[PDB]
Structure 1
Amino acid sequence: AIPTNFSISITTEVMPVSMAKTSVDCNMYICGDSTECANLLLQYGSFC
């Protein structure tokens, strides 16, 4: 069996290429800018 008539068709596909690039300031996250939090934070060094 050999094809005689035919068709064409467009299909779509979708795939991401990037991401929502973020950033987290530590002071306004782990502290909330209390003076107490920044001074126990030195006991963890430059972990942030």
Structure 2
Amino acid sequence: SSIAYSNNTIAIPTNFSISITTEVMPVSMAKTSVDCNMYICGDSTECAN
């Protein structure tokens, strides 16, 4: 971009526009739960012991 610096000049807007922007924010994650034996062992009595 070309920007010209001046000691006695100012640029002022003469019109305006309305801009609507989106911002997506994660707020939560899936709640998970696990079981000791059913995962590590399953249904084995000896493995549970």
Q: How many residue pairs were aligned?
A: 39
- TM (norm. structure 1) is 0.73
**5+ long unaligned stretches in structure 1:** 40-48
- TM (norm. structure 2) is 0.72
Following TM superposition, the consecutive aligned residue runs of length 4 or more in structure 1 with deviations greater than 2 angstroms are none
Instruction: Decide which structure has greater helix share.
Output: 1
Greater relative contact order: 1 or 2 (C-alpha under 8 angstroms, separation 6 or more)? 1
**5+ long unaligned stretches in structure 2:** 1-10
The sequence identity of aligned pairs, in percent, is 100
> Whose radius of gyration is greater, 1 or 2?
2
When the two chains are superposed, the root-mean-square deviation of aligned CA atoms in Å is 0.7
